[PDB]
Structure 1
Amino acid sequence: NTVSSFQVDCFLWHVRKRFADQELGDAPFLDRLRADQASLRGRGSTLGLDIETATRAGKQIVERILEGESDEALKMPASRYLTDMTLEEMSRDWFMLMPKQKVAGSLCIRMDQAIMDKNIILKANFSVIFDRLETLILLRAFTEEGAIVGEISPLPSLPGHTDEDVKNAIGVLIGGLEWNDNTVRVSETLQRFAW
């Protein structure tokens, strides 16, 4: 119930206190330390439980979360994060004059039917693993003139998407753009990891 979360609190306080004992903690850090020895004393008093049995039981619950870390904290490989786009580029507002939107396997594909006879380049920020595209943060289509005209975005409310899903979304976006005579080009950091 509440007692268990309060054992968690008492133990975690004792933990950051052992931290602070090296005296590397920040002034606000230690302020929170005081604030929390206060709050925990007030709760242990207007509750009715000693805080040492609570510290022991919070040690027990960190042993359970440590059994969770012992189930295999860390997977077996490492990831790499690749960026074509400044944050600005990722978050810059844009619009399409005649939208074309589509959903395909946890991926939103947007483009503007009104873009014709432009050179478009595709930039993406994503994640690789085993030299293969692990997960897509975002992709965007820019005109050499500088305009955003298409976007491949991850759908949050779905259980993940794959590298083949992204190569398919890219191919479909490029097809839609090329239909209107737009010469579409891919940033090297996508050639090298998603074709």
Structure 2
Amino acid sequence: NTVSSFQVDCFLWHVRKRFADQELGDAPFLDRLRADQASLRGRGSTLGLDIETATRAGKQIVERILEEESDEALKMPASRYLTDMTLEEMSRDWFMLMPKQKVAGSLCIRMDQAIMDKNIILKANFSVIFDRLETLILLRAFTEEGAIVGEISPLPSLPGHTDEDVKNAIGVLIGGLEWNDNTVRVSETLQRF
């Protein structure tokens, strides 16, 4: 497909662009770049296509090719690690005055019934794969003041958890926190996955 090719081309041009802006890039390289820029512009018009749009489309094609890569020398795993929490934040000391604990989906859910009227955000350190959650390592609930008042942790002593298991556990946690007019928010990385 002429269209598929063109998208890939606009995207690769874009990368050779950023490269030339990193101000590496020798003479004939900046020559080809200029020539390809003219070429693409006209191919754009002939195809009645929008370059910014077409660049975006080829980005998704190129992406899939790299994640598809079976070559050993170049292969990437790929699972990836997202950290919402600093190291200090994960291992930190916390206690509950009026503790509530609940195993669900191979996940241990905890919260302090005593806490009231706080604004709380849910931060999780966890791995993603294929644009969804793979393994949850830890998720903790923090008041505006950074105090920890809740935590969902994996139980490894028994089978693995889904991202379904996790999203459920969260919802169960928010709903417990809200009883005491706590307003509970969720990180933007927890929002996807």
TM-score, normalised to structure 2's length? 0.60
Distance across 1 between alignment mates of 2:58 and 2:186: 53
SS in 2 for 1:69: coil
SS in 2 for 1:96: coil
**Aligned-pair distance for 1:17?**
46
**Aligned-pair distance for 1:158?**
1.1
> CA, structure 1 residues 56+104, in 2 after alignment: closer, same or farther (shift >3 Å)?
closer
> CA, structure 1 residues 26+92, in 2 after alignment: closer, same or farther (shift >3 Å)?
farther
- Asked whether the 8 Å contact 1:116–1:180 carries over to 2, the reply is yes
**Aligned-pair distance for 1:78?**
2.0
The CA RMSD over aligned residues, in Å, is 14.8
Using the aligned pairs only, state the percent identity.
99
**Aligned-pair distance for 1:186?**
0.5
Specify the structure having the higher radius of gyration (Cα). 1
- Asked whether the 8 Å contact 1:77–1:129 carries over to 2, the reply is no
> Could you list the runs of 4 or more consecutive aligned residues of structure 1 that deviate by over 4 angstroms after TM superposition?
1-77
**Aligned-pair distance for 1:135?**
0.8
Moved more, 25-34 or 121-130: 25-34
> CA, structure 1 residues 88+71, in 2 after alignment: closer, same or farther (shift >3 Å)?
same
Query: Aligned pair count?
Result: 193
Structure 1 residue runs of 5 or longer lacking an equivalent are: none
**Aligned-pair distance for 1:84?**
0.3
Structure 2 residue runs of 5 or longer lacking an equivalent are: none
Distance across 2 between alignment mates of 1:133 and 1:172: 18
Moved more, 131-140 or 33-42: 33-42
Distance across 2 between alignment mates of 1:7 and 1:130: 22
TM-score, normalised to structure 1's length? 0.60
> CA, structure 1 residues 54+71, in 2 after alignment: closer, same or farther (shift >3 Å)?
same
- Asked whether the 8 Å contact 2:98–2:113 carries over to 1, the reply is yes
Distance across 1 between alignment mates of 2:178 and 2:56: 66
Structure 2 residue aligned with 1:134: 134
Distance across 2 between alignment mates of 1:84 and 1:59: 26
